[PDB]
Write a protein that binds this ligand. Sequence first.
Ligand code: NAI
Ligand code: NAI
Ligand code: ENO
Lengths: 285, 281
Amino acid sequence: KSLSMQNVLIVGVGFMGGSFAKSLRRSGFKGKIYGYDINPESISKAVDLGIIDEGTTSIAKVEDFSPDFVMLSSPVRTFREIAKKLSYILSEDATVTDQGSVKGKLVYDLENILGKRFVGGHPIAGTEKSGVEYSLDNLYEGKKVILTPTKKTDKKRLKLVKRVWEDVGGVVEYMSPELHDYVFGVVSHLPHAVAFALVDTLIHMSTPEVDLFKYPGGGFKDFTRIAKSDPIMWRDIFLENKENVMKAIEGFEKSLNHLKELIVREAEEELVEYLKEVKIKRMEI
Amino acid sequence: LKSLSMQNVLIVGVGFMGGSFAKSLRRSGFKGKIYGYDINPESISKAVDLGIIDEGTTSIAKVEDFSPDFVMLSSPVRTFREIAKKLSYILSEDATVTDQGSVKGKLVYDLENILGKRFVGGHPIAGTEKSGVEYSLDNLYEGKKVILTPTKKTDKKRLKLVKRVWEDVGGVVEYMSPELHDYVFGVVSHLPHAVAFALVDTLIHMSTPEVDLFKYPGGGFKDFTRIAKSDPIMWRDIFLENKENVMKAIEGFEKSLNHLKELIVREAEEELVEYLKEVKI
Ligand SMILES: NC(=O)C1=CN([C@@H]2O[C@H](COP(=O)(O)OP(=O)(O)OC[C@H]3O[C@@H](n4cnc5c(N)ncnc54)[C@H](O)[C@@H]3O)[C@@H](O)[C@H]2O)C=CC1
Ligand SMILES: NC(=O)C1=CN([C@@H]2O[C@H](COP(=O)(O)OP(=O)(O)OC[C@H]3O[C@@H](n4cnc5c(N)ncnc54)[C@H](O)[C@@H]3O)[C@@H](O)[C@H]2O)C=CC1
Ligand SMILES: O=C(O)C(=O)Cc1ccc(O)cc1
């Protein structure tokens, strides 16, 4: 068939950018796969592992790569400024998309920056990890990938990006940018927030003689986990999606306060009921 | 040969933990009798069918026929008192009673007051959210901490016996006072359970006619809330029996949550990053 893609640019050649790179080449993409990063060593590791053909830490060099498909894979807050530079560098017919964990306002701003080139996406792909050395060539298989079109998005580009994620094995679905940021503020951002705060709880509730981290086997262990998420990624998510993050935190307090009220009142059947309902809902997934 | 020191074992509450104890004791090479007491006849018959207990009963009177010299309390924590009262007459003066319950505290003193010199307080930090004797495992305690909570009142020969039995099944024994235990496990165990249950409850009431938030897990919801599937009866007993510590643990947590909230509302680039770098120890 056809060559709807010649040179792709990976912006942010880390764990997620590298896995997209890897997955792409392994789906049969024959074109040039390029890297842009602020960290030269990110570029260096990537080249040495085969993950990219050539890169640079100068944004302007990127023009010599003539890229027609850009995957933004650096922390979300770097996107606007990178986009502003790319809007002069990139052809009118290049396609730009992303893997950032928040959409919402950012998608509208990137459309305004890159015009019709932009399509928002977010793969709901787990395994935590950081850095290109960990990137995987089968990361997106089976996972949902959310694209956030608006009435402004170019349908043919939306079609391209959707298909690219199918080639790497993602199962694609559409959501408004605003719905995305409510949903994931609740189902993703909130659990990380409370995990972070739990770990903080054991810090300040320890005494000098009694380290509480010595006893993880009673429920704490699982929280130990994506509490080891990247602080930069999470600071970035928490602020960029601040309003939904806050509303999600408010609802959790509502549930936590209900459970508290029951324990205080020393209820019992009510308490048992409440716990059976959440067990049931949690089991259904 | 202190096969003499333990001949007839009674498992009270033949569920996940009581059956894991039965199973590990047998596998450790115990040749004595293992009996079961439970209000659910199905717990008893499933345990018999699976070779977990030799026989058992749903009638507390009948346990006197079993002549138990060692009793492992393994039913929900708020059942121990009434059960123990019946046991204090059925059991020989030289019988030892111990438990696996997740709360200690007052309950330890109460059980000493009901059972006299017979009782030793214990809590294995082991197992999962599973419930039911069908999920019981013969290696549940290998390399896991077991906390015993002896007091000035504890029979020292019974503490040593209980201690060794936990060791025979792979456990690593340490001691805590009943009050320290309940503080420690109020925050590292009972707290994280409350918070997981309350996490799932949140997805329920933030769902809407537009959206079932349960359709999107594995942005981190799934892994953090496995323990939200734990047993409601077991957890109800825990939260109520350990209420004073649990409420303190939740206050402390809300202090941490509040501090994170302040850093976000005001967008403190730097305090925030350093706060989240807290998880890196
Ligand atoms: N961690 C996860 O499971 C998921 C992450 N994401 C998104 O993927 C993105 C990246 O995450 P990871 O690859 O895990 O991070 P990472 O920390 O492995 O890689 C980030 C890369 O971006 C580079 N970079 C940072 N600032 C930059 C800038 N201003 N300009 C150019 N390059 C820059 C870093 O040098 C590094 O090479 C984030 O937007 C995140 O929200 C999305 C879904 C899941
Ligand atoms: N789930 C876990 O990982 C751990 C639980 N524990 C403690 O172990 C004890 C048992 O927990 P699981 O084995 O998971 O619960 P389970 O629900 O698997 O088993 C409880 C068994 O107790 C029986 N039972 C209930 N009320 C009773 C009564 N009044 N008299 C006699 N039998 C009764 C039930 O029919 C059931 O067969 C609880 O005190 C719990 O706090 C301790 C450490 C870990
Ligand atoms: O990982 C889990 O499910 C646990 O939290 C296991 C657990 C539950 C209750 C306890 O008293 C001790 C250990």
